[PDB]
Amino acid sequence: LHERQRYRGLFAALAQTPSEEIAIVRSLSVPLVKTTPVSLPFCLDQTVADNCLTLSGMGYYLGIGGCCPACNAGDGAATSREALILAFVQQINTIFEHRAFLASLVVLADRHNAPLQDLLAGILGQPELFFVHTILRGGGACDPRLLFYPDPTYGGHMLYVIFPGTSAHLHYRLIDRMLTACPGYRFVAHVWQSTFVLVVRRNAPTVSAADIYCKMRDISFDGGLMLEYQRLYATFDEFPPP
C-alpha cells in the first residue's frame, strides 16, 4: 500500500549498493516548488530563515532565497547587531542618512501640535524601529518611507514601513535580520490604499534627544519629503493595524 509497489524494486536494488543510494539521496538539490502563495495580512514569524517575500500586482508569495533571481541579483551592507547599534548611536553624525526617519517625526509632531523633542526622546527609547529603518535602507539608494503611530496596547509607537511603487520584494537575509534583531517586536505585512506596508509592533546604548533635536532644527529637510509624509499620514490615519 501507499505506492509500496513502485518503490519496492528500487529499494531492493539499492539495498545491495549503499554508496549509490547515498549519491542518489544527495542528488536531490533543486526544489520543485520555488514559490508559495500567502494571504495579507501576513506575519513574518511564519517565514523560515531563507524565505523572501514578494508583494505585487501578480499577488503575494514567499520564495526560496537560493532560487530567487531577485535575491541573487540583490544579494543584500553590514547588518551586525553591533553595526546597527553603531548606526543608532552615530545617528547624530549621519543625520542626513536618516532624513526619512527624522523628517517623519517632524511632520508628525507638526500634524498633532506637540513638542518634537518629547516625541523624539520617546521614539529613541525604541531603538528597534531605527534598526528596521537601517536594515531596510541597505546602502541608501533604496529608501522606504516611515510612519509612527501610537500603540494603544503597550504605549510608545509602532512603525509603518511604506514601500514605494506597486511592487515590493523583501530579501530573505533582510527578513531574518529584522526578526532576529528585534525579538520583542512582531512584523506584519499588509496593504492599504494601493500601498504595500510593513507594520512593526511590540509583541510583549543611550543617546541625547536634545542634541539631535537642535541639529534637526539647524538643518532644513528636503521639502516634498515633508509633503510626502503629510500625504502619507493623511492616508494612514484611518488604516487599522493587524
Binding site: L1, H2, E3, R4, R6, Y7, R8, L10, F11, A15, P18, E21, I22, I24, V25, S27, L28, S29, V30, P31, L32, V33, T36, P37, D45, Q46, T47, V48, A49, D50, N51, L62, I64, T180
Partner: protein, 159 residues
C-alpha cells in the same frame, strides 16, 4: 538483526550532524511497535535537512504488514527532534498542505506527517510520481526558543 540493518540504512541517509540512530525495542517486519523506530536530533543554531519521504518509504518498504509510516517533529526546548513511527500515535496528523509548506514550532511543540498524507499532497501537486523524481525534505532551522520547518519537495539534478 533486520531492524538494525533498517535503522543503519536510515542512519546512512540522515546527515551526520543530526545525532541519533535507533530510537528510545526489538521487532520483526511482521510485528510493528507503537514506540518510535528511530530518533534523530539537532542542537541550537543548526540548519539541517531531513529526508523525510525517503525514510518513510524505506520503513514502509521494510514492513510486511500494511501500515502508514509517520514522522514526528518536536521542538523540545533545547533541540529539534525527528522520531520515526510505523503507525502515528494516538492524540499530529499534519498541518502541511500544498498551500503551506512552513511550520514553526514553539517550545514543547509537535508537528508531523504520514506517508499517506505526503503522497496525497504530492498528488495534489503536479509533480512526478515516478520514483526518485520527487522527494520531500524538511528544511530545519533551529533558532531557540523556536524551530523553523519547511516541507519542500526536492527534485533530481541529473547533471
Amino acid at each position: 538483526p533486520a531492524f538494525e540493518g533498517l535503522v543503519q540504512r536510515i542512519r546512512l541517509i540522515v546527515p551526520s550532524t543530526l545525532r541519533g540512530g535507533d530510537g528510545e525495542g526489538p521487532y520483526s517486519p511482521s510485528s510493528l511497535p507503537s514506540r518510535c523506530a528511530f530518533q534523530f536530533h539537532g542542537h541550537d543554531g543548526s540548519d539541517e535537512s531531513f529526508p523525510i519521504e525517503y525514510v518513510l518509504r524505506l520503513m514502509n518498504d521494510w514492513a510486511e504488514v500494511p501500515c502508514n509510516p509517520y514522522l514526528r517533529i518536536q521542538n523540545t526546548g533545547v533541540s529539534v527532534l525527528f522520531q520515526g513511527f510505523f503507525h502515528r500515535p494516538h492524540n499530529p496528523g499534519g498541518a502541511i498542505t500544498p498551500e503551506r509548506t512552513n511550520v514553526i514550532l514553539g517550545s514543547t511543540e509537535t508537528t508531523g506527517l504520514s506517508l499517506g498524507d505526503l503522497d496525497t499532497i504530492k498528488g495534489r501537486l503536479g509533480l512526478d510520481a515516478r520514483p526518485m523524481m520527487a522527494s520531500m525534505w524538511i528544511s530545519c532551522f533551529v533558532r531557540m526558543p523556536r524551530v523553523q520547518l519547511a516541507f519542500r519537495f526536492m527534485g533530481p539534478e541529473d547533471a
